[PDB]
Amino acid sequence: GTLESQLEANKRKQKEIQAMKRQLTKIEDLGEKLEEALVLDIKFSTIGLAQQWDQLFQLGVRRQHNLEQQIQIRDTPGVSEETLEEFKTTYRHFDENLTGRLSHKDFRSCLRGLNYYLPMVEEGESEPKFEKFLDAVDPGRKGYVTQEDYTYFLIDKESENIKSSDEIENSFQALAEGKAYITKEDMKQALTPEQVSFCASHMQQYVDPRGRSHPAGYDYVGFINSYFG
Amino acid sequence: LLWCQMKTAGYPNVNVTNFTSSWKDGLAFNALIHKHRPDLIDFDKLKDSNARHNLEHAFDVAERQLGIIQLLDPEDVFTENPDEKSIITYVVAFYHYFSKMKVLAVEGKRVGKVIDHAIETEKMIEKYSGLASDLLTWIEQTITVLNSRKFANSLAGVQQQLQAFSTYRTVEKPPKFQEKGNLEVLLFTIQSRMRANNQKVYTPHDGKLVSDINRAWESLEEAEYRRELALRSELIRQE
Numbered sequence: 065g066t067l068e069s070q071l072e073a074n075k076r077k078q079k080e081i082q083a084m085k086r087q088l089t090k091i092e093d094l095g096e097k098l099e100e101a102l103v104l105d106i107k108f109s110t111i112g113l114a115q116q117w118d119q120l121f122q123l124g125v126r127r128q129h130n131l132e133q134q135i136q137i138r139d140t141p142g143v144s145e146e147t148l149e150e151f152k153t154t155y156r157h158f159d160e161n162l163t164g165r166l167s168h169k170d171f172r173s174c175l176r177g178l179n180y181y182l183p184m185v186e187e188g189e190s191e192p193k194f195e196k197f198l199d200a201v202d203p204g205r206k207g208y209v210t211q212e213d214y215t216y217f218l219i220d221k222e223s224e225n226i227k228s229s230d231e232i233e234n235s236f237q238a239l240a241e242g243k244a245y246i247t248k249e250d251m252k253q254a255l256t257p258e259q260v261s262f263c264a265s266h267m268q269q270y271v272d273p274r275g276r277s278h279p280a281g282y283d284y285v286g287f288i289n290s291y292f293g
Numbered sequence: 294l295l296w297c298q299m300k301t302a303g304y305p306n307v308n309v310t311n312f313t314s315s316w317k318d319g320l321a322f323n324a325l326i327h328k329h330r331p332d333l334i335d336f337d338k339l340k341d342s343n344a345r346h347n348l349e350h351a352f353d354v355a356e357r358q359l360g361i362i363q364l365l366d367p368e369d370v371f372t373e374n375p376d377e378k379s380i381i382t383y384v385v386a387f388y389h390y391f392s393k394m395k396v397l398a399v400e401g402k403r404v405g406k407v408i409d410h411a412i413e414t415e416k417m418i419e420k421y422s423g424l425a426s427d428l429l430t431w432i433e434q435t436i437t438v439l440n441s442r443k444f445a446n447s448l449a450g451v452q453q454q455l456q457a458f459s460t461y462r463t464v465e466k467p468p469k470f471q472e473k474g475n476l477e478v479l480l481f482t483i484q485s486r487m488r489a490n491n492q493k494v495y496t497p498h499d500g501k502l503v504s505d506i507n508r509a510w511e512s513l514e515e516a517e518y519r520r521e522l523a524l525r526s527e528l529i530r531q532e
Contacts, residue, residue, distance in 0.1 A: 105521070115467055119474035123481065130485050137489060157299065176296050179329075181392040223402065229491065232407075239400050254401030259408040291492045 067135050074128045081121055088117060142224030151218050154178065155211060165208035168198065174214070229292040236284040245270035245281035263287075297325060297384065304328060313375040319347030319367070322383075326351060326359070329391050333358060345371060361386050407490065414486045418495075421479045425501050428472050429509065436513050442523065448531045455524060473506060 095110045158174035159166045166174060172194060175182060182193055201209050201217050226232070239254065240246040252260050270283035294312060301307045304324045309315040316322065318341040327336045333354055339347050348367035356362045363386070365379055444454060480503065483495060 105525070107518075109462065109466070111463070111467060112470060115471055115474065119471075119477075123474075123478055126478065127481070127485070130482075134485070134489055157303075173295065173299075177299060179388075179392045179395045181389060181396070221399070223399070224406070226403070226407070235400055235403065238396065239404075254397055255404055255408070259405065259412070262408065262412060293493065 067131065067138070070131055071128075074124065074131065077124050078128075081124065085117070088114065138225055140225060141219055141222070143219065143222045147222065151215070155214060165210050166214070168207055168209075171198070171201065171209045171214065178218075229288065232288055232292065233285070236288070240284070244272060244283070244285070245278060246284055247280050247282065294384075296388070297321070300328060301325060312377065312380050316370060316380065318344045319349075319351060319370070320344075322355075323347060323351040325387070326354070330359075359387075359390065361390060410486075410490055411492075414483065414490065417479065418483065421476070421483065422501065424472070424479075425476060425506075428476065429501070429506065431469075432506075432509050432513065436509070436516060439513065439516050439520065442520065446531075451524070451528050451531055455528065458520070458524070473510065476506070477503070 092110055092114065098104070098106070154174050154177055155166065156162075158170045158177070172182070172184065175194075175197065176184070180197075182197075183191065197217070198205075201213050220227070220231070236246065237243075240250065248260060248264055251263060255263075264282075267282060267284065267287035269277055270281035271277055272281070294309075298309045301309045301321055301324050304327075307318075307320045307324045309321050320336075320339060320341060323334055323336055323339065327334050334351070339350070341347070345367045348370060352365075352367065361383075363379070363382060365376070369376065369379075444450065480497075487495060
């Protein structure tokens with residue numbers, strides 16, 4: 065379930081190898097006399113299993129190092145101290161009452177201060193972006209967001225490591241500005257043309273709900289569900 | 294208005310309370326385009342008494358530097374008569390523009406990280422494919438050589454192929470079994486790579502599998518082994 069426990073398993077393997085390199089000596093030295101004991105045949109070659117033992121040692125060391133590499137992938141946010149200080153200052157500015165919990169209007173004002181594309185105060189209309197943000201922050205409809213409740217959204221929105229493919233799912237939707245299809249030109253203001261050529265080569269053409277196919281329509285849903293699903 | 298007032302009240306020397314008279318000095322537009330992008334304008338040497346300059350500075354870095362075009366004058370704001378629709382269009386314009394390009398940069402780094410990791414995996418995927426093809430072709434063209442079970446009749450000759458086969462044992466077998474371990478290391482590298490990237494199964498193509506390599510590799514062991522049997526059978530008869 066967690067990646068720290070695997071360290072111990074690797075450590076258990078590291079507890080084996082020295083003992084068994086012990087054991088390798090009591091094989092190989094023994095071979096030293098039987099090959100001096102006027103050749104003969106043993107159905108077997110000791111040197112070969114010496115390379116498989118060395119291969120097991122090297123793969124164990126590499127697997128361990130790659131496992132700390134993975135735990136450094138998943139446990140480094142990459143958010144700068146300036147960004148965290150700005151988020152804390154925005155949280156203090158939105159919570160003028162210093163109660164430790166910002167209201168839904170206060171959360172919307174802080175999101176507007178966070179440069180979020182949220183149109184507000186339509187004449188008797190309801191939009192789903194603010195509702196989805198409130199559900200991601202406070203799914204229980206408590207009406208207040210704590211310091212950590214907004215900080216979790218900020219950390220999941222800021223940078224670097226990724227928990228699940230669902231954010232890729234609904235973030236190519238935001239990159240396509242809510243459109244079900246995307247273009248190469250839209251992809252070429254954010255991504256290197258190396259990767260744009262890769263994406264255009266490996267991701268297919270989009271089909272809308274009406275069934276008509278654009279020449280320039282590209283579906284990220286099918287591509288993501290094909291590679292990551 | 295709350296957004297711009299809150300963001301410009303923290304910014305020094307500018308107080309914005311309305312959309313008509315708080316904008317005449319021209320410092321507020323320049324402050325709001327200076328927070329998101331400080332690198333273009335020296336805001337500190339601007340003064341409100343040069344207000345007609347202060348707009349036409351910020352208005353000149355508005356269209357061409359950023360990509361937002363609309364036709365007004367510094368005098369139009371400078372007149373007492375206000376234009377509500379023009380300033381509303383401007384504020385919604387840079388609000389949408391800056392939000393768009395902020396989420397653009399964030400999503401760009403997100404996608405770039407993953408796709409760089411991916412393409413770094415598949416180059417050495419083609420490396421693994423090439424080495425696997427070369428190794429299996431080598432295997433099947435060497436087993437053909439080792440099938441040959443016919444040679445001359447001499448004690449010196451039988452001992453000479455015994456010596457040659459022992460040299461083929463003790464020098465060549467460690468590296469030509471070492472590429473199998475290197476291939477296994479590369480395949481586990483791909484496994485760890487993919488569940489770091491969390492995509493679907495690679496599914497290496499048929500004819501290139503670890504089971505096929507194992508089958509061929511005990512096959513060459515068996516062929517070696519009833520090579521060895523016949524070798525010492527004729528050796529002990531000649532002896």
